[PDB]
């Protein structure tokens, strides 16, 4: 009955920020444990986070070398919650202009393209409007590339420099967030708590 949360910790980027944000979100829950995940030699988690800040190609490389791709697929196929954050959200798709020819996790149909603004990266607080579930408001962003997906998979939208893009995505129990909830003050904590709750209640 205890809940096991896993956070893939191979990087690139500072993954400990998300670890600390998730255990902050977890303080009012008992019997919830959080583990750093760097290999597939573990039982499946109830909730698996894929974080990262960096190049799409380096994100996929580290998932490949540490034998975590099939581990991630096992969670999807067993209807456990898989949540990509920042680069991790982009890895959910099939490919990205950032890393030509590199295959992503391909868990959600679509691809990743450069934002149109003359000022990149998109960096700062921007508003996210959710279709449901998660709280509308301002979250902290830092990214140059964006997802392109079908409307049914769009969960939240944000406008930057005239361009509306998916700041959050959902396919079944696969969630992606383009922003950093662990750097989004109070509303980021309420979002991470809501993710935990989504996986506790089915």
């Amino acid at each position: 009955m205890g809940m096991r949360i896993g956070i893939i910790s191979v990087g690139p980027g500072n993954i400990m920020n998300l670890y600390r944000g998730v255990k902050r979100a977890s303080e009012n829950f008992e019997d919830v444990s959080i583990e750093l995940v760097e290999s597939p030699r573990n039982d499946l988690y109830d909730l698996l986070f894929i974080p990262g800040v960096g190049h799409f190609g380096e994100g996929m490389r580290r998932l490949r070398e540490n034998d975590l791709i099939d581990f991630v697929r096992k969670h999807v196929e067993d209807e456990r919650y898989v949540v990509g954050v920042a680069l991790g959200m982009q890895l959910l798709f099939e490919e990205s202009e950032e890393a030509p020819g590199v295959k992503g996790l391909s868990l959600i149909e679509g691809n990743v393209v450069k934002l149109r603004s003359r000022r990149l990266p998109h960096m700062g607080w921007n508003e996210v409007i959710f279709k449901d579930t998660f709280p509308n408001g301002y979250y902290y962003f830092v990214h140059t590339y964006r997802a392109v997906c079908e409307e049914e998979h769009v969960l939240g939208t944000t406008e930057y420099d005239g361009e509306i893009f998916p700041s959050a995505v959902r396919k079944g129990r696969i969630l992606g967030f383009q922003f950093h909830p662990e750097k989004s003050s109070k509303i980021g904590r309420k979002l991470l708590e809501k993710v935990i709750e989504c996986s506790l209640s089915r």
Partner: protein, 252 residues
């Protein structure tokens, strides 16, 4: 739409916030971690920790502070003050800082900007620029606002963008700590020269001054004195800015 940012700058000495504050509600008002948490709680958008310390023990004390802050803080924070090389910048970012702010060492070795950006991305690099009118010209000053480099502000702003900086922290040495207002002429001067985000710094004393900085083209407004002595309430300031048409982050 992106929010115009309100940034608090905390002067730290020996791992403590200089003077302490006027926040007797806190268990310790000179503790950088507790004070940063308080600012996140009241609506500050980003923090700058500025190490004005003079110990021989300074690199370790800054690393201790970054580790203490990264453990508990839930908003982005920049660290600056005496970051002299890639090696120092790297240890600070790896310990948990979202950005490093460099000034003197960037002027004396502009390739340091590119070195950090090439490992950590341009978003990790803030170049602090201290500038002053000299003979009718805006000049760049190093060594704590002290040394006229002979370099023109317009040349340096452009060079800073070419080297790969992510953001400019623009301080007018004439206005620093005066509570008389930001140097909106200098902000207007810099705005068309670069497409980088500009943090206005130095002089904030009243709510109108933050509005002036945004009208002048700043993407963010930073203050220290007005927050340290509790003269401006962050939520009241954000409410004032929103009534005057500024897109700020103001949550219910």
């Amino acid at each position: 739409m992106l929010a115009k940012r309100i940034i608090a700058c905390l002067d730290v000495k020996d791992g403590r916030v200089v003077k302490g504050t006027n926040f007797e509600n806190l268990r310790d008002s000179g503790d950088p971690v507790e004070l940063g948490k308080f600012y996140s709680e009241i609506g500050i958008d980003e923090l700058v920790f500025l190490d004005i310390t003079a110990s021989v023990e300074k690199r370790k004390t800054m690393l201790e502070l970054v580790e203490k802050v990264a453990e508990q803080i839930d908003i982005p924070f920049t660290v600056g003050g005496g970051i002299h090389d890639f090696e120092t910048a790297s240890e600070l970012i790896l310990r948990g800082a979202d950005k490093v702010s460099i000034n003197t060492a960037a002027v004396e070795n502009p390739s340091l900007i590119t070195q950090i950006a090439q490992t950590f991305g341009s978003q990790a690099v803030v170049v602090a620029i201290d500038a002053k009118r000299v003979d009718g010209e805006f000049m760049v000053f190093t060594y704590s606002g002290k040394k006229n480099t002979g370099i023109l502000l317009r040349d340096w702003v452009v060079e800073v963008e070419k080297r790969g900086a992510g953001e400019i922290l623009l301080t007018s040495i004439d206005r620093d700590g005066t509570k008389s207002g930001y140097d909106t002429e200098m902000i207007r001067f810099v705005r068309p020269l670069t497409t980088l985000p500009i943090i206005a710094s130095g002089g904030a004393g009243k709510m109108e001054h933050f509005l002036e900085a945004f009208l002048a083209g700043a993407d963010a407004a930073l203050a220290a004195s007005v927050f340290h002595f509790r003269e401006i309430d962050v939520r009241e300031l954000k409410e004032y800015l929103k009534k005057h048409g500024v897109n700020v982050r103001l949550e219910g």
